[PDB]
Design an enzyme around this catalytic site. Sequence first.
Site, PDB file in Angstrom:
ATOM      1  N   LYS A  38       0.837  -1.201   0.000  1.00 51.61           N
ATOM      2  CA  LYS A  38       0.000   0.000   0.000  1.00 51.61           C
ATOM      3  C   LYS A  38       0.869   1.247   0.000  1.00 51.61           C
ATOM      4  O   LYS A  38       1.937   1.270   0.611  1.00 51.61           O
ATOM      5  CB  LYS A  38      -0.919   0.035   1.228  1.00 51.61           C
ATOM      6  CG  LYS A  38      -2.036  -1.006   1.247  1.00 51.61           C
ATOM      7  CD  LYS A  38      -1.498  -2.423   1.412  1.00 51.61           C
ATOM      8  CE  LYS A  38      -2.622  -3.417   1.697  1.00 51.61           C
ATOM      9  NZ  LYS A  38      -2.112  -4.794   1.949  1.00 51.61           N
ATOM     10  N   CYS A  39       0.404   2.280  -0.692  1.00 55.93           N
ATOM     11  CA  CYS A  39       1.130   3.542  -0.792  1.00 55.93           C
ATOM     12  C   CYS A  39       0.477   4.586   0.113  1.00 55.93           C
ATOM     13  O   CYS A  39      -0.463   5.271  -0.300  1.00 55.93           O
ATOM     14  CB  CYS A  39       1.103   4.032  -2.240  1.00 55.93           C
ATOM     15  SG  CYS A  39       2.713   4.362  -3.026  1.00 55.93           S
TER      16      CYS A  39
END
Lengths: 164, 164
Positions: A38-39
């Site tokens: 996830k960013c």
Amino acid sequence: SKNPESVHDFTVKDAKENDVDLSIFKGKVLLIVNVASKCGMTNSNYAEMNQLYEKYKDQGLEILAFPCNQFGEEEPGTNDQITDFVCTRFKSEFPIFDKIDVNGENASPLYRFLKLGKWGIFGDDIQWNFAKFLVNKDGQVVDRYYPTTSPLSLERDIKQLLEI
Amino acid sequence: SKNPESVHDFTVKDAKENDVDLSIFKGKVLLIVNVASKCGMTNSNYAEMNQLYEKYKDQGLEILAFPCNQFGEEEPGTNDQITDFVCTRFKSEFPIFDKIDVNGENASPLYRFLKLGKWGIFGDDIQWNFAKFLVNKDGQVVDRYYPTTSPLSLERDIKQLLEI
Ligand SMILES: [Ca+2]
Ligand SMILES: [Ca+2]
Ligand SMILES: [Ca+2]
Ligand SMILES: [Ca+2]
Ligand SMILES: [Ca+2]
């Protein structure tokens, strides 16, 4: 080397794809943990890990984060990207290495080794994102925690493991 | 509510084969530990749980220790002896229940349920003697620890559940 005796016999890739001889960490307590792709780092695990770093950063505690895409059964919305899908960035205090697999066929030699820890007691597949591992100053796998154990709950063992 | 929704939906036998409904523990945080079946409270885990108990029994903590002989049943020089295969006496303040299987075709229905916890994150078979689980006041499994994690290292999570 060739004889998996300690975590120090292992060299892994960092975010820059540069080799890192884990053997340079001896004398320090390794807290190995797999993080998501996830960013954004929204998860509470990172915050707590930062604190743990904030507190034992200059005492021997080194956090080794490893990105892994083998979980996060995301609910797609525009994820179909096979040329640039993994977070092209990881903003944290502690060091974040190159993305690697923790389970299955292409599993990282390190995790394979961390899994033999304590006579196979640690032999389970990493259950999900944020499984925690504690390695002593000699590169031996001492503890293992389920993803559901917040980093802060590993303080007592971190503390002891450092002789503080 | 035929299908179990919580740990409270189970009835287990105690050391003296008297049915015990886990509902009598609602409103209390539970520390569920599988213990060795042989005699001897020499393993360090006992002393630590003893300490944990003395410091929390009267705050909302209950400890359900379940004897099991699925791990290293070949330890006692004279274990082969079948007269039960579980210690006929277990001196301890916290309650010790009847022997149960934690893994396999006869695993206690309670351990099947706990292995369901956190969407399967706790699905791993019990690795060895002394694995730990923390169940909240409501009867749901919220934490799991490897046998190697000493009890005292679960204090933070206990206080957090008992709310202290
Ligand atoms: Ca993969
Ligand atoms: Ca937790
Ligand atoms: Ca009931
Ligand atoms: Ca055997
Ligand atoms: Ca907790």
